[PDB]
Amino acid sequence: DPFYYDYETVRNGGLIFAALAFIVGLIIILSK
Amino acid sequence: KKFIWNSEKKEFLGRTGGSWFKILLFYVIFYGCLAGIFIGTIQVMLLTISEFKPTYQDRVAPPGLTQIPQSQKTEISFRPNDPQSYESYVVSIVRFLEKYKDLAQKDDMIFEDCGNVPSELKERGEYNNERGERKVCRFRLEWLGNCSGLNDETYGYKDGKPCVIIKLNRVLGFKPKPPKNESLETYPVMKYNPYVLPVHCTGKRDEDKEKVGTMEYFGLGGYPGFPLQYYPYYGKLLQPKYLQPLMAVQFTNLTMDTEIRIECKAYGENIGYSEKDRFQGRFDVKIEVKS
Amino acid sequence: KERDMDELKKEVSMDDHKLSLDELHRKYGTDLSRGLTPARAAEILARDGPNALTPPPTTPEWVKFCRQLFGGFSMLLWIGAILCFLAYGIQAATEEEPQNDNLYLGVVLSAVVIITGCFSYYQEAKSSKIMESFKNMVPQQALVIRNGEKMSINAEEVVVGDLVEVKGGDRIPADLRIISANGCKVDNSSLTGESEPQTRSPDFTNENPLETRNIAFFSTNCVEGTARGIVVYTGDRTVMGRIATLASGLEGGQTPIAAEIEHFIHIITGVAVFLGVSFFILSLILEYTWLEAVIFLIGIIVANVPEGLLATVTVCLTLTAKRMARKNCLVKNLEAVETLGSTSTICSDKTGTLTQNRMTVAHMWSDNQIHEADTTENQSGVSFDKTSATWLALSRIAGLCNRAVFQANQENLPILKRAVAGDASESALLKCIELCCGSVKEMRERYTKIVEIPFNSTNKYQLSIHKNPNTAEPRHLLVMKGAPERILDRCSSILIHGKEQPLDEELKDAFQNAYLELGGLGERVLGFCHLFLPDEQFPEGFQFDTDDVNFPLDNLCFVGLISMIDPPRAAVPDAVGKCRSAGIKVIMVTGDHPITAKAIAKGVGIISEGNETVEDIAARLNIPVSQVNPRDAKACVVHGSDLKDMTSEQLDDILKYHTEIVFARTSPQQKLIIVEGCQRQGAIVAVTGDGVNDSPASKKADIGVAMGIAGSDVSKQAADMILLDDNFASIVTGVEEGRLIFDNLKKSIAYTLTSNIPEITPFLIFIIANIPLPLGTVTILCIDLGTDMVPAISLAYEQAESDIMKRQPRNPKTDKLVNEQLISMAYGQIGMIQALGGFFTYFVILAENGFLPIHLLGLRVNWDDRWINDVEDSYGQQWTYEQRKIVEFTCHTPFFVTIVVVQWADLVICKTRRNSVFQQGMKNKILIFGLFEETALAAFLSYCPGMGVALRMYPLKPTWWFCAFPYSLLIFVYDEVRKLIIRRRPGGWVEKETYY
Numbered sequence A: 001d002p003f004y005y006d007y008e009t010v011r012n013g014g015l016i017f018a019a020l021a022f023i024v025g026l027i028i029i030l031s032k
Numbered sequence B: 001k002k003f004i005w006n007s008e009k010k011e012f013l014g015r016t017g018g019s020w021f022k023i024l025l026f027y028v029i030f031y032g033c034l035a036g037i038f039i040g041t042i043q044v045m046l047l048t049i050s051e052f053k054p055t056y057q058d059r060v061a062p063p064g065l066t067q068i069p070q071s072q073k074t075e076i077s078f079r080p081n082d083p084q085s086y087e088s089y090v091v092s093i094v095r096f097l098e099k100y101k102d103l104a105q106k107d108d109m110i111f112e113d114c115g116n117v118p119s120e121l122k123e124r125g126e127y128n129n130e131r132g133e134r135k136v137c138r139f140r141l142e143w144l145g146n147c148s149g150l151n152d153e154t155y156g157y158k159d160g161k162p163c164v165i166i167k168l169n170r171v172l173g174f175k176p177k178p179p180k181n182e183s184l185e186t187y188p189v190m191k192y193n194p195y196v197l198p199v200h201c202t203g204k205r206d207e208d209k210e211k212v213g214t215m216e217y218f219g220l221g222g223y224p225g226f227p228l229q230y231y232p233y234y235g236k237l238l239q240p241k242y243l244q245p246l247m248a249v250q251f252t253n254l255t256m257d258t259e260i261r262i263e264c265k266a267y268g269e270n271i272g273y274s275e276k277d278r279f280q281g282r283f284d285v286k287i288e289v290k291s
Numbered sequence C: 001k002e003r004d005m006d007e008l009k010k011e012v013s014m015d016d017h018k019l020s021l022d023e024l025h026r027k028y029g030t031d032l033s034r035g036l037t038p039a040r041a042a043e044i045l046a047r048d049g050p051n052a053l054t055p056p057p058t059t060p061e062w063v064k065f066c067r068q069l070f071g072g073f074s075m076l077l078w079i080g081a082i083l084c085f086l087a088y089g090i091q092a093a094t095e096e097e098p099q100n101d102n103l104y105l106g107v108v109l110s111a112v113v114i115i116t117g118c119f120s121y122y123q124e125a126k127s128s129k130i131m132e133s134f135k136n137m138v139p140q141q142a143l144v145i146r147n148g149e150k151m152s153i154n155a156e157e158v159v160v161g162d163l164v165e166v167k168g169g170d171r172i173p174a175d176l177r178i179i180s181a182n183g184c185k186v187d188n189s190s191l192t193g194e195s196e197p198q199t200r201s202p203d204f205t206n207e208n209p210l211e212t213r214n215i216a217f218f219s220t221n222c223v224e225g226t227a228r229g230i231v232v233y234t235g236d237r238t239v240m241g242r243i244a245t246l247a248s249g250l251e252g253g254q255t256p257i258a259a260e261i262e263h264f265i266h267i268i269t270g271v272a273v274f275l276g277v278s279f280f281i282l283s284l285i286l287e288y289t290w291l292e293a294v295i296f297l298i299g300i301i302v303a304n305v306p307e308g309l310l311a312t313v314t315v316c317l318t319l320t321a322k323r324m325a326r327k328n329c330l331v332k333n334l335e336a337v338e339t340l341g342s343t344s345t346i347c348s349d350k351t352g353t354l355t356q357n358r359m360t361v362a363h364m365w366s367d368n369q370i371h372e373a374d375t376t377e378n379q380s381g382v383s384f385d386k387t388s389a390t391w392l393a394l395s396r397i398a399g400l401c402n403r404a405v406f407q408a409n410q411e412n413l414p415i416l417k418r419a420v421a422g423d424a425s426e427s428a429l430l431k432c433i434e435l436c437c438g439s440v441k442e443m444r445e446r447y448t449k450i451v452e453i454p455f456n457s458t459n460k461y462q463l464s465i466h467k468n469p470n471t472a473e474p475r476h477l478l479v480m481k482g483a484p485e486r487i488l489d490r491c492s493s494i495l496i497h498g499k500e501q502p503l504d505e506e507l508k509d510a511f512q513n514a515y516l517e518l519g520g521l522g523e524r525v526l527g528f529c530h531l532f533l534p535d536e537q538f539p540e541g542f543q544f545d546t547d548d549v550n551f552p553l554d555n556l557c558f559v560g561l562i563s564m565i566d567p568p569r570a571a572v573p574d575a576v577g578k579c580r581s582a583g584i585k586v587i588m589v590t591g592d593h594p595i596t597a598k599a600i601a602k603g604v605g606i607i608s609e610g611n612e613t614v615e616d617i618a619a620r621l622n623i624p625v626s627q628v629n630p631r632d633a634k635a636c637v638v639h640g641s642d643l644k645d646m647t648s649e650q651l652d653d654i655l656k657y658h659t660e661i662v663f664a665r666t667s668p669q670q671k672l673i674i675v676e677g678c679q680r681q682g683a684i685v686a687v688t689g690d691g692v693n694d695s696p697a698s699k700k701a702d703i704g705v706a707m708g709i710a711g712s713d714v715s716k717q718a719a720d721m722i723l724l725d726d727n728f729a730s731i732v733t734g735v736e737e738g739r740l741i742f743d744n745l746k747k748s749i750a751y752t753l754t755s756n757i758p759e760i761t762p763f764l765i766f767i768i769a770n771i772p773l774p775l776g777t778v779t780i781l782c783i784d785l786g787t788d789m790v791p792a793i794s795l796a797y798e799q800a801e802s803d804i805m806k807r808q809p810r811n812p813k814t815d816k817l818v819n820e821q822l823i824s825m826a827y828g829q830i831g832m833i834q835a836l837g838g839f840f841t842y843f844v845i846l847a848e849n850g851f852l853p854i855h856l857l858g859l860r861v862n863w864d865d866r867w868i869n870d871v872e873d874s875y876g877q878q879w880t881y882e883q884r885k886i887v888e889f890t891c892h893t894p895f896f897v898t899i900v901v902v903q904w905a906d907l908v909i910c911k912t913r914r915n916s917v918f919q920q921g922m923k924n925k926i927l928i929f930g931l932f933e934e935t936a937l938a939a940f941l942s943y944c945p946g947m948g949v950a951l952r953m954y955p956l957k958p959t960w961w962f963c964a965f966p967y968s969l970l971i972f973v974y975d976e977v978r979k980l981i982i983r984r985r986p987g988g989w990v991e992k993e994t995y996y
């Protein structure tokens, strides 16, 4: 039915994006 | 010392005249471009959606269950004697049913006589515009017995024992699916399980369920629900002057001068519920016929 | 009535020093050789107060914490919190089921002020904490003669009118009136700024108590000799006591950064209340009642307050202050970190600040040639030629014939900073020989001294004879030093490259011009000579008892002159040049003698070489000084004696027509008058000093700079910045950072002020167009205090776009921190684009879910209704209350995301004010992390489980993330072409209208 949206997959992708962008930024401010 | 208003060397409100014109001309050109850009993008946005279907329909998954007396707090408090006490109710009922009169549904080019018995769904092709303006099945006020409009008794439904009809939230392409014959304890209901969406009212606790004595339902042919012959909806553009099914509920044996809570829960497979939205699927009302 | 008390302290002191010994003992009632009975001492001790200044006014910690909770920015946030609770009380008592939005906002504003107060207070408290670790007040007992006996008592137990004796090294307890001296020299450097040790004689010499020699002063140190004296002034009534009490009771003023913050709030609230009022009237003109319109007025005014700009500005200031503390340049006040950059006139001190305040061997004479010795504080300069025989002879004359030796612990300390016992001149000579000629220990004991002759009261000469350890000649080595006029009369032979020559005037006059060269340079010169005593007329057994003529006074062999002076610190001249390069007027203010002050001025850069004083022109033309026009003289020396007879207009003209000024022989009170004269012009003033005379000058100055070790405690407390390393170049670092953080604050402020337009426009058109609310309150909190915090903090890390030490100091009446150009950019152009992008994402969300944008007009009437659960969209669908509210909140979340997306471009363009991003470059790692964290946080707030429940922020369909991209790219391209026309066209349109 068109009255359903896979919100769990989009939500999961958004949380993975939020985790990766933050750990990448931490690597950015840790130039070693 | 605050006369920076003007000077003999030209300044108004802070700057000169030639400066006011330069800044104003810039702001007019700047904001003009901003307006043209917002309009162009909003136009592309208009080109990404169609006219016969909303691009997303998941936010209206469980249809609602509304009523005719749109009370300020879903409460029906009036006096069985004072005609002005229940004027706010009757006014909204008459205006709601003003489009269901036999004179309103008179054109045969846009109306179709469904039938005196609830039947299967009526699918009028696809949702495109290849076909003309679809037909809308008629629904006369006579179907709601003892709660009809201005036919023989403009009773106002309030001389004791009020009437409260329920309506299913009109959703495009929504196909109601009543529960299976394997009904999981659904409160005395007729055996017309296949071609009508059941709706059953009740109290809310051990107190409300006792105060509410007897309830009488009215619908198409005498069934407490919505007939499947009126679905699905094909949008306002393709089906203007569409009449969704109606179903009345009368509370005969009520305890006067007592506010009691009623929950009219619509049952079905395609009918969801929500603990946060008391209107999705179910419906609440606080009736109090204080004499 | 404290006004009169401060006025009687701005006046230079008076005295009764000019009195006969009998009149003094009669006025005070004191025995000249026995002092007084201990009874009288205790009777006065318990009569007027112990000999010690009243402690400073203690500042409780709750007072300064309450101070940090106030100010100007925190006050605007306070009035905002008040308006928030006012709106919540109104909404509560007048309507049904009131919302907690306004309450949430009021508690947020209160939390903002509390947090800013806690960290700003922790920083200022940390500065004062590390400052208390520098008070190493060691008690010093004075030698007092009472009842005819010598006793050493605490300095506080000393009273008025009692005999006091001081020894070379001891500190002058109170203000004494010398009665008997024995070649006594005191050190008036910390008080009157007199560099060389001024001697103290019992005879009255000058009408000024400071210049005369019959007065010893509080906090001064008796360098050499011993003396006696009657205590005239005690406790706070002393000279340095009146100076310190004046310092504490002076006004601090209003810093430049603070005045900029105040004018900033003036514009913030100006447009805030203009919007709130014009929209209050607009809402009443539409339909909304006074009850609703009042809430609209409060909402629009409160919404226009940068809630997070307080923490960002605080962190900005703290970051630059961190860099200051890294270079040992501690600031006591936080905003004091900015004042150095805005300065345009630096009033400096000579002794201890411009100079090292220490006698050092400046130049030497040998082979009729001047040899400049290294006089740097850390020995990092040119070394003279030390391979000639003239040097090998002169160095022994100095290392042997000198009453100077190192002390006990003088081992691990360097050759210069170590303590030397004896005369200051002999100390400079001992250090120079110990530094450029190996060691003086084994060099002094190598020549066993037989008979010596110390310095004489008349014809001051110091001679001594020593045995000769050379393996070729057993003749006795006689050496003598003294003033060149005393040695020229007792010399006939002259040393050159190892051999001798007669006193021919061809080279003797060449010696005279060298003497006047080193002397006219403000230095003190001495002459050194030696002679080989014939072992045939004075054998190795003969003893030359110091009675008769055993040594030939004349016919000696002159080797060379040795001058000496207090040299300036290492990076002092270069730093002065850098300040002049930045357009800062350098004005010397010292109480030292003008003959030395002018030389140090020319030596450091205050007086440019070539510029002439009003007296120099009269000397070059051999005409009276009253003839030359002062307009033909760029520089000028102003004596303190003449300064006493000056008016306000005269001092104004001195500063207006003379570009290089040097105030000499000026009292501390006159120093304060000079600082005030500089402030009358309207320019930012910075006073750099060390002694107590710099306390009333460092206090009244817009910013005071004290030396961390070579400075006095009073001027160190009355100052606003401390140099813990005494590296005067830190002043240059300060003036650079003060301009740097100023421009960066401009960038960060324009950033926080840009997001205000898309934060308020949703509510504005919500009132006008009657559309559903596009942006929520908690989402606004997630933008102002959530995401944007890291980008705004990173904007402090931006570097210089051009050379800031090249541009002139900012005009305070012209270059405002937030001028009308920044408002035209943030509120006018960039914020406008961001608001349109937010509305675009808004209409996209509603049109895709069934509510066409044209249909959204007049919809909020029934949309906000909590019971109309059949709200028709554009397709005829019926929406319940919670369903459409879910759409509205999941419409607030992407509006917030849209804000972050447009803030990407706004941050990149705000990073550069004039340069292009291609030129400057994304080298700011804190900014890169700012964008990564900003985006990751914005995504987390939307997709974390339970956010549509707690913060009412629902997850977003991925296409929403791209609804804001074109607006961001547009912002970036527009600002880039802006900075490009600013570069190519520096004339006026793009520069005077948008460049902020």
Ligand SMILES: C[C@@H]1O[C@@H](O[C@H]2C[C@@H](O)[C@]3(CO)[C@H]4[C@H](O)C[C@]5(C)[C@@H](C6=CC(=O)OC6)CC[C@]5(O)[C@@H]4CC[C@]3(O)C2)[C@H](O)[C@H](OC(=O)c2c3ccccc3cc3ccccc23)[C@H]1O
Pocket (backbone or CB within 6 Å): C087, C091, C094, C095, C096, C098, C099, C101, C102, C105, C292, C295, C299, C300, C302, C303, C304, C763, C773, C776, C777, C780, C864, C865, C866
């Ligand atoms: C025009 C009003 O619109 C609505 O409310 C607006 C205004 C305000 O009430 C808001 C919160 O409370 C305001 C807030 O003030 C300002 C904000 C914090 C401001 C910001 C400042 C800032 O710094 O960042 C953002 C921008 C907007 C804001 O974020 C909020 C947003 C939510 C609001 O709710 C919006 C209501 O529909 C109101 O009606 C009723 O409330 C209402 C009745 C009122 C009177 C008598 C009987 C009633 C019976 C009702 C029965 C059932 C339901 C409602 C009843 C209308 O009068």
Ligand SMILES: *[C@@H]1O[C@H](CO)[C@@H](O[C@@H]2O[C@H](CO)[C@@H](O)[C@H](O)[C@H]2NC(C)=O)[C@H](O)[C@H]1NC(C)=O
Pocket (backbone or CB within 6 Å): B145, B146, B216
């Ligand atoms: C509608 O109302 C009428 C009254 O106007 C009801 O008619 C009564 O019905 C009962 C049986 O239930 C009879 O005993 C009465 O004699 C009837 N009275 C009249 C005046 O006709 C009728 O039952 C109601 N309809 C429904 C479905 O409840």
Ligand SMILES: *[C@@H]1O[C@H](CO)[C@@H](O[C@@H]2O[C@H](CO)[C@@H](O)[C@H](O)[C@H]2NC(C)=O)[C@H](O)[C@H]1NC(C)=O
Pocket (backbone or CB within 6 Å): B213, B214, B253
């Ligand atoms: C309608 O409700 C009334 C109650 O209001 C019912 O009648 C009551 O029955 C109880 C016993 O159970 C008696 O004690 C009361 O005196 C009765 N009251 C009246 C007014 O009769 C009645 O049975 C209900 N009728 C229907 C058809 O449900």
Ligand SMILES: CC(C)CCC[C@@H](C)[C@H]1CC[C@H]2[C@@H]3CC=C4C[C@@H](O)CC[C@]4(C)[C@H]3CC[C@]12C
Pocket (backbone or CB within 6 Å): A009, A010, A011, A012, A013, A014, A015, A017, C935, C939, C957, C958, C959, C961, C962
């Ligand atoms: C201009 C360029 C360099 C910015 C680079 C960052 C862009 C490409 C990133 C920033 C935020 C990102 C979005 C973050 C969140 C979501 C939800 C997720 O479940 C699907 C991906 C999606 C839809 C991403 C698409 C790509 C995106 C827009």
Ligand SMILES: CC(C)CCC[C@@H](C)[C@H]1CC[C@H]2[C@@H]3CC=C4C[C@@H](O)CC[C@]4(C)[C@H]3CC[C@]12C
Pocket (backbone or CB within 6 Å): C918, C969, C970, C973
């Ligand atoms: C309507 C809008 C999108 C127009 C977009 C035009 C932009 C994207 C174009 C116009 C001119 C282009 C620039 C031309 C010059 C430079 C300098 C070079 O060393 C790097 C490329 C760089 C930085 C280009 C980047 C892209 C650029 C800025």
Ligand SMILES: CC(C)CCC[C@@H](C)[C@H]1CC[C@H]2[C@@H]3CC=C4C[C@@H](O)CC[C@]4(C)[C@H]3CC[C@]12C
Pocket (backbone or CB within 6 Å): B041, B044, B045, B048, C844, C959, C960, C962, C963, C964, C965, C966
């Ligand atoms: C000359 C060139 C650079 C002009 C570029 C115009 C482009 C960037 C504009 C024109 C129409 C715009 C689109 C209009 C419709 C949609 C669908 C929506 O769900 C997300 C936004 C999105 C995807 C917009 C993104 C930006 C867009 C593609």
Ligand SMILES: *[C@@H]1O[C@H](CO)[C@@H](O)[C@H](O)[C@H]1NC(C)=O
Pocket (backbone or CB within 6 Å): B181, B191, B193, B194
């Ligand atoms: C449901 O079951 C009942 C008997 O249990 C039967 O009479 C009725 O016809 C059934 N209906 C359907 C639709 O199967």
Ligand SMILES: [Mg+2]
Pocket (backbone or CB within 6 Å): C189, C190, C193, C349, C350, C351, C352, C353, C689, C690, C691
């Ligand atoms: Mg000094």
Ligand SMILES: [Mg+2]
Pocket (backbone or CB within 6 Å): C303, C305, C306, C307, C755, C756, C759, C784
């Ligand atoms: Mg804000």
Ligand code: NA
Pocket (backbone or CB within 6 Å): C251, C252, C253, C698, C699, C700, C701, C702, C703, C704, C719, C720
């Ligand atoms: Na100050």
